[PDB]
């Protein structure tokens, strides 16, 4: 798996590959790893599919109940609920979640939650097995306040490299754009991104 | 391990049980009675794990005595054996199982028939003309397959136990220090006090 | 559970539920015991309000607690069975731990303890 | 154990503490850990004590023979090559960890050697349980172009850091100074900052305190 | 029972004549990956206490939230919460020590080593250590992890016993701390160049310094090092 | 440890050594391995020092409760079974106790019960328990008669512990002697093996084994 | 498990004024079982004395080995082996079996016949020479011996006083070890003569 | 796997006089081959003229002391400020230890004070609650070095009256507080020489009918 | 360890960090991992320092004997000697060698020899624990026939990123330039390459 | 394991050795002579691993017999024991060691003294007034410590072995099927053929 989320001028973009393997066999080549927990709060999932699916569903439940009582939750609050579940059940979970969201006040935000259940607010985040190969690339190429098109290009170039080298990554590059305008689903096929 | 033998003849069940109690490198006792009377006409012998063996036998004894008082009636050997089997079967899936093997020799006063039941620590019950627990069976069963007859007198039964004990004393590695022998018949339970030199 | 204080003190210092339990005993069929020099004899009466009973199977008023101890009573028959059962269980428990049957005083002290407990426990008469 | 090497402008100095241990017990309070490969090539060891002493004497022996055969002063690189090839062959089973230092016709040299056969080169080095304490001092005070006096001081301060702060190290500081032009000078017990205080009592017993069953004269002569 | 994932390395500290200094770098490692570079491992509590934490960062953040709750709870029904009944360094520590030992006794430790630095109300210096085992100890200098092996030796050359404390100044103490952070950057493979340093002084209060860097490093001698024995070029 | 107890014409002799060890380290030479439950009851200790010490002290409390409650001294059988049943509840938890419960009552006469942490409970006339039990058995069995004097019986117990103290590395220190009769237990002193060995060697002519 | 703890035993050596002392217990056991109380652990080759603790079969084998080697030494050299030189022979003989070592703790004691100088030394099982001016200890009660020696010892003791110190170091150390004791023997060694004394001790 | 135990080293020593008792212990605290503190007291005045040390794993030692101190506090609350006699403290500590029989306090505990006749008393504890009153006892890392020295010098073991042919033992004439202090100080310098976990400082608590007094002495720091 | 070798217009450049660790302790912070086996045939070493030193010394011996008999060996020949030692002793070795050399005919050449003892001729190669973090960067940034200055910049930037993310890498960046003009040693210190 | 006892009296050495050979659950033989004559006045008994025990004994026997013929002379008991110790000491660091424990009882004709040597499988030799191998020593050593005197007659030594064997027959868990007793003195080696009911 190769996943990332990048803040930019207008908000935030989540990116992911679509490959899930059991050993060397690709059990799913069109997986959707970009998961909605609220209107404009989404997450990228890595680790045990069972675990991250269960986590995300519980988080989505909490934020639905939060909204009913107290109105729209902040991205921080969503990250806090992920953290609470991951940290308190660290012995029985293998989950690496990136939480990304947009609200009008704070703009775009990215919180990464590694294996232990710690939380780290970052300008951008990368995770999944494929991410190791793009630490160098991303650190030399990321800039703050990029445009939507620049950010889409940064994610597309980054994940294409992660996919190129990581066997556990592949398929299509999915993105989810989060801004004041709303939510936009993007998808990029092998014939485009391999050529980069 | 400890020697536990049983034999049902025409009118009685005879139980023979070794006298040794050994811990490690030392024989602590050579006169141990590995048996409890559960009711006037039902006797149980036992062998297995150190503490479990007596704790189980006494617990069974207490329960059968309780029944006898409540009902003012002695349970049949078949009923007692079934109760014992169920208790063992419970323990095998419990936290710490009773590691105890038993023989139950009884005289059914309603049927006027002697009855011998072999039950292992798993709750494996079976009714037999003769029975053994542990390694002792590996010698005695074939011996008894040859010499046993169903119409034997109590005295012919005792002669047949002597043959079994002599074979065990010859071929078994352990010194089990002889046996205590008890007869269960229509008149109850008595001990053959002079088997050491009979 | 249900824990209502049914046995309580009244202003004059009586526990009416215990004293009313005695009235149940008064209604019960007569029972008598006398000690000899070498024996004890327990006598009870049987009613004649209804006759046509099977005496083979009808529970007798004298019950064995152990081979050496007996218990008779007067009062509620159903209540007596609970005491008798508990007495018999305790008798076997004693033989198991002490390796000796109960004294008559001890068996009595146990039964009396059970009865006492039901005078200051919640939810019971 | 704490051992260090320090290069200076015209040579190299090595030093070591003097504590030898068997587990938490101190066997020898004044062990000499500075061994000689050749007259002007000295050696300090850590790890399995028998292995360091044996391997230092074997290579020392072969180096002497080589020196005689070639009619040349022994070189530190030869000691290095012979030590590492021996140790590598035994795959770390010879638990010898050495700082080797000396001077030869090609100049002054300082190397470290690990049990599996790897070697390093440097201007200052430390090994043993007290390695980290000593290195902290070396990383705090080392500079390029040290004088002989400054290097002896620095090396000696580095061993002290091990003595006081490491439980595997203690007692005295031994030093050997190897200068290009001159003879190597071994400074046995260069410092003695751990003298045992005067005891509170004498435990000399009155004669006849010990009971004796039997007594006899032993024959040595023949 | 658990294993640490995201980790912080050494925390180092010492007392001086008028107070205490404590420092720790800004790194959250993930095994041998130097993953997070903006991690603050010094946690101030009020104006008189700084807690430095090494070990598992997820646990550090949990401990961080416990300390904020302590401040809140202390201010409840407490008119003297910012005066006589404010939190002392000793209270903060004893609380943490209790928790650390109870968690180890439950076979579920907070996988950390903690140093609580501060000044008590009477002016006394407070410096005490506690870790995942619940082990506690005080010393004129304290350090965790590699800092114990490399920093203590250097810091103990300045303050070797109790009597060296009144003789040691802030300037001398701070320089010694800063030098030790450089030494740890040289020889600890899980260290960062960027660190935070905190001074707690009985007169001048809490001075928290962020975004410090190791400077004045010696590397030039490396050019003269070639080969590993016999190579000349 | 070595401990023994045996019945004879004149009641019960009880003898124990006094050595404690942790591995090969000699922890103590002065451990009291007899516990005085009451004037007619003794218990011996072998195996885990804390386990024996703790649960036999507890046994004492349980025996004292029995007296108050039943207005009568507890039987040796009943006292031994309290401990047996307690130990059985812990079976598998890793308790380590080899124990003898020795005493006199009117009903039972002189009685000895072996009780151990496996849950084994045995009534008997002779028992030796502990790491040096075999050495004590060798000397006790080959010199035991029912019709020994109180003087000869006490000596036999003493000499049997000495035997084990000598040959068993984990036994030694001193010998503590007791004698139990209808009237109760009588302490017959602490006998240091340091002096007892050489005294016995000389007077008895035994232990040619050793350089005298 | 540990070949060094099966048989038990101790050896201790001390220097004094123009003298050395070396002592040992007499026990030979198998775990808890004591087997022999005659098992001496000190040997001598000419004027050089060697104590050996540890696995008994190796104690015997090594004694025979060094008897063998010091005999050939004397025939070739035409003189008796000296303590300094014998220490090196033991060290090199032990290291020869580096990866299959004798499970022993040898101790050398003697006086050089030329310089008159008292000499003691110890070794680990693979030959690392512990040279000490004051004392050397070995065996199952080595910790105890270290404690007694460090406390009791002082330099320049006369033979009569050294006997007391070494005897009492050994005795009290043995009595805190289950596997040591069962009798003891002490050698007081001078230039001209050597006295051997058997000590009275606990037999438990 | 998480190991809930550690080893903080150090050593403690308890000796009981005729009308006094001392409990001593070094002030060094270590982990592996590093010193944690040169001065971390482990011998405490618990009230009611009882001194106590629980040496080994310090976190268990502190917990035990803490619990025992609290036990003394509640004993006063629950029994009309009655003094906790030394024998009563000892039995109380047995139950504190045995309560954690299946997850033990990893310590050797020693307490000292006076008994109810004013005689000096020392009680020493097995890690799971086994105890006995003794004349002297060493505990901790160097216990195996100091105990035999105490057997010899406190209880006069293996010492006979000169000239009596080893038939008459040296009598058990008992020691003054001055003589006991000398043995304590000599024991701790001996242990500091030979055990790497012992040193830095010695702290002795002396108990008399007049209360508890403290004395401190420097030990070697290597 | 982070090591690489890059061919370019005039020849080839080897680059390496200077950190060797035992656990988390840096045993040497000024290691030289660029090892000469012949005048213009060098190697970058990764894995066991004992193994790679022993391998390089044996190779150096063979190439010295080869030269004495048959003249200057080709870079291919050097790689083969490395391979023969690594492949035939694969059970008892943990070595990742990159071999780089310049001759007049073939120009600059790079051969990488991974753990198993296989040989791969490449335009450039990266290896060591730090290499994982720069697969992305190096793939997007490498070009063939670069100039000396461009290749030095490429190695310097790549190794600064490897050092940045890998705790096992650090110290100085050493380089060795192999061309017709000869052999040039370069060194770059932290104050420079961390600023990139 | 097998019983191997030895005792040195005034003028002879007496070796007692058990007769049982047991494998697993069966006693295969009850008349096994666990001994070999090495020379006219030297006898060795043995116990240990199943095959190694007799293979070793016979190997030693052959070697001593070879020495006897070559030299026309009988090696002393001491010399034979030292030869045996070295052979055992060699095997312990070999590929597959001999797991055999022996007692060597001999009469030295030059000294006119009886001698008993105990040697274990490691090569641990020791000269004793009495000896045993395995668990049997745990019972006999204390017994002999008490009743042994160095000036005993051969008849008294045999009474003393009787007491050792009775203690083993009482307390050892194994049935070792009695012992074969042999006496070594100035007139050679003879077997006491009536120890079964002496
Ligand atoms: C004999 C010495 C043979 C071992 C005798 O059985 C002793 C009993 C009396 C002292 C009551 N046993 C020993 O002294 C104990 C031997 C070890 C045990 O058998 N075992 C089950 C622990 N020694 C002690 O009990 C020592 N206690 C410890 O071993 C407990 C430590 C637990 C680790 C946290 C202690 C009293 C020296």
mmCIF file of N, CA and C in Angstrom, chain H residues 175-220:
data_model
loop_
_atom_site.group_PDB
_atom_site.id
_atom_site.type_symbol
_atom_site.label_atom_id
_atom_site.label_comp_id
_atom_site.label_asym_id
_atom_site.label_seq_id
_atom_site.Cartn_x
_atom_site.Cartn_y
_atom_site.Cartn_z
ATOM 1 N N UNK H 175 29.669 -7.538 71.487
ATOM 2 C CA UNK H 175 30.394 -6.353 71.053
ATOM 3 C C UNK H 175 29.722 -5.035 71.407
ATOM 4 N N UNK H 176 30.552 -4.009 71.584
ATOM 5 C CA UNK H 176 30.090 -2.644 71.812
ATOM 6 C C UNK H 176 29.699 -1.987 70.492
ATOM 7 N N UNK H 177 29.021 -0.847 70.581
ATOM 8 C CA UNK H 177 28.644 -0.077 69.393
ATOM 9 C C UNK H 177 29.868 0.426 68.621
ATOM 10 N N UNK H 178 30.950 0.743 69.329
ATOM 11 C CA UNK H 178 32.188 1.179 68.680
ATOM 12 C C UNK H 178 32.807 0.030 67.880
ATOM 13 N N UNK H 179 32.854 -1.153 68.484
ATOM 14 C CA UNK H 179 33.410 -2.335 67.830
ATOM 15 C C UNK H 179 32.553 -2.793 66.632
ATOM 16 N N UNK H 180 31.230 -2.702 66.765
ATOM 17 C CA UNK H 180 30.317 -3.036 65.666
ATOM 18 C C UNK H 180 30.509 -2.086 64.481
ATOM 19 N N UNK H 181 30.619 -0.788 64.756
ATOM 20 C CA UNK H 181 30.816 0.204 63.693
ATOM 21 C C UNK H 181 32.084 -0.107 62.891
ATOM 22 N N UNK H 182 33.157 -0.482 63.585
ATOM 23 C CA UNK H 182 34.414 -0.862 62.931
ATOM 24 C C UNK H 182 34.236 -2.035 61.957
ATOM 25 N N UNK H 183 33.466 -3.041 62.363
ATOM 26 C CA UNK H 183 33.221 -4.214 61.516
ATOM 27 C C UNK H 183 32.368 -3.856 60.302
ATOM 28 N N UNK H 184 31.393 -2.977 60.517
ATOM 29 C CA UNK H 184 30.529 -2.488 59.451
ATOM 30 C C UNK H 184 31.362 -1.733 58.419
ATOM 31 N N UNK H 185 32.168 -0.778 58.884
ATOM 32 C CA UNK H 185 33.002 0.023 57.985
ATOM 33 C C UNK H 185 34.024 -0.819 57.229
ATOM 34 N N UNK H 186 34.640 -1.778 57.917
ATOM 35 C CA UNK H 186 35.584 -2.694 57.274
ATOM 36 C C UNK H 186 34.894 -3.624 56.274
ATOM 37 N N UNK H 187 33.669 -4.048 56.578
ATOM 38 C CA UNK H 187 32.910 -4.891 55.652
ATOM 39 C C UNK H 187 32.624 -4.144 54.349
ATOM 40 N N UNK H 188 32.226 -2.880 54.471
ATOM 41 C CA UNK H 188 31.849 -2.071 53.311
ATOM 42 C C UNK H 188 33.031 -1.562 52.491
ATOM 43 N N UNK H 189 34.213 -1.471 53.089
ATOM 44 C CA UNK H 189 35.409 -1.170 52.301
ATOM 45 C C UNK H 189 35.883 -2.432 51.581
ATOM 46 N N UNK H 190 35.789 -3.579 52.247
ATOM 47 C CA UNK H 190 36.101 -4.858 51.609
ATOM 48 C C UNK H 190 35.186 -5.120 50.414
ATOM 49 N N UNK H 191 33.881 -4.936 50.608
ATOM 50 C CA UNK H 191 32.901 -5.162 49.540
ATOM 51 C C UNK H 191 33.061 -4.160 48.399
ATOM 52 N N UNK H 192 33.435 -2.926 48.734
ATOM 53 C CA UNK H 192 33.691 -1.891 47.733
ATOM 54 C C UNK H 192 34.916 -2.219 46.872
ATOM 55 N N UNK H 193 35.909 -2.880 47.463
ATOM 56 C CA UNK H 193 37.092 -3.311 46.713
ATOM 57 C C UNK H 193 36.777 -4.396 45.690
ATOM 58 N N UNK H 194 35.892 -5.322 46.054
ATOM 59 C CA UNK H 194 35.709 -6.560 45.292
ATOM 60 C C UNK H 194 34.386 -6.686 44.531
ATOM 61 N N UNK H 195 33.378 -5.894 44.892
ATOM 62 C CA UNK H 195 32.107 -5.912 44.170
ATOM 63 C C UNK H 195 31.876 -4.570 43.479
ATOM 64 N N UNK H 196 31.620 -4.617 42.174
ATOM 65 C CA UNK H 196 31.537 -3.409 41.342
ATOM 66 C C UNK H 196 30.277 -2.574 41.569
ATOM 67 N N UNK H 197 29.243 -3.197 42.126
ATOM 68 C CA UNK H 197 27.978 -2.524 42.432
ATOM 69 C C UNK H 197 27.959 -1.856 43.811
ATOM 70 N N UNK H 198 29.068 -1.927 44.547
ATOM 71 C CA UNK H 198 29.132 -1.381 45.905
ATOM 72 C C UNK H 198 30.165 -0.262 46.004
ATOM 73 N N UNK H 199 29.786 0.844 46.642
ATOM 74 C CA UNK H 199 30.700 1.969 46.846
ATOM 75 C C UNK H 199 30.000 3.301 47.061
ATOM 76 N N UNK H 200 30.703 4.380 46.708
ATOM 77 C CA UNK H 200 30.204 5.764 46.777
ATOM 78 C C UNK H 200 30.046 6.304 48.202
ATOM 79 N N UNK H 201 29.156 5.703 48.986
ATOM 80 C CA UNK H 201 28.919 6.156 50.352
ATOM 81 C C UNK H 201 28.304 5.086 51.227
ATOM 82 N N UNK H 202 28.586 5.167 52.526
ATOM 83 C CA UNK H 202 28.002 4.277 53.521
ATOM 84 C C UNK H 202 27.143 5.104 54.456
ATOM 85 N N UNK H 203 25.950 4.607 54.762
ATOM 86 C CA UNK H 203 25.048 5.280 55.682
ATOM 87 C C UNK H 203 24.575 4.261 56.704
ATOM 88 N N UNK H 204 24.880 4.526 57.975
ATOM 89 C CA UNK H 204 24.566 3.615 59.070
ATOM 90 C C UNK H 204 23.526 4.246 59.990
ATOM 91 N N UNK H 205 22.460 3.501 60.266
ATOM 92 C CA UNK H 205 21.456 3.912 61.241
ATOM 93 C C UNK H 205 21.637 3.078 62.507
ATOM 94 N N UNK H 206 21.839 3.753 63.635
ATOM 95 C CA UNK H 206 22.034 3.097 64.926
ATOM 96 C C UNK H 206 20.789 3.303 65.786
ATOM 97 N N UNK H 207 20.315 2.222 66.403
ATOM 98 C CA UNK H 207 19.106 2.257 67.218
ATOM 99 C C UNK H 207 19.440 1.973 68.681
ATOM 100 N N UNK H 208 18.961 2.845 69.564
ATOM 101 C CA UNK H 208 19.101 2.680 71.011
ATOM 102 C C UNK H 208 17.760 3.013 71.653
ATOM 103 N N UNK H 209 17.687 2.953 72.981
ATOM 104 C CA UNK H 209 16.478 3.381 73.691
ATOM 105 C C UNK H 209 16.229 4.887 73.549
ATOM 106 N N UNK H 210 17.254 5.629 73.130
ATOM 107 C CA UNK H 210 17.144 7.073 72.916
ATOM 108 C C UNK H 210 16.707 7.451 71.494
ATOM 109 N N UNK H 211 16.450 6.454 70.648
ATOM 110 C CA UNK H 211 15.958 6.698 69.293
ATOM 111 C C UNK H 211 16.898 6.191 68.216
ATOM 112 N N UNK H 212 16.846 6.840 67.054
ATOM 113 C CA UNK H 212 17.632 6.451 65.889
ATOM 114 C C UNK H 212 18.638 7.547 65.539
ATOM 115 N N UNK H 213 19.901 7.159 65.358
ATOM 116 C CA UNK H 213 20.975 8.087 64.981
ATOM 117 C C UNK H 213 21.610 7.643 63.658
ATOM 118 N N UNK H 214 22.122 8.601 62.886
ATOM 119 C CA UNK H 214 22.727 8.329 61.575
ATOM 120 C C UNK H 214 24.203 8.718 61.514
ATOM 121 N N UNK H 215 24.991 7.914 60.804
ATOM 122 C CA UNK H 215 26.385 8.244 60.490
ATOM 123 C C UNK H 215 26.658 7.950 59.017
ATOM 124 N N UNK H 216 27.420 8.827 58.368
ATOM 125 C CA UNK H 216 27.746 8.680 56.952
ATOM 126 C C UNK H 216 29.255 8.631 56.728
ATOM 127 N N UNK H 217 29.686 7.755 55.820
ATOM 128 C CA UNK H 217 31.098 7.633 55.461
ATOM 129 C C UNK H 217 31.272 7.482 53.956
ATOM 130 N N UNK H 218 32.262 8.182 53.404
ATOM 131 C CA UNK H 218 32.594 8.076 51.985
ATOM 132 C C UNK H 218 33.168 6.696 51.677
ATOM 133 N N UNK H 219 32.798 6.160 50.516
ATOM 134 C CA UNK H 219 33.406 4.946 49.974
ATOM 135 C C UNK H 219 33.988 5.260 48.599
ATOM 136 N N UNK H 220 34.866 4.386 48.110
ATOM 137 C CA UNK H 220 35.491 4.576 46.797
ATOM 138 C C UNK H 220 34.444 4.614 45.682
#
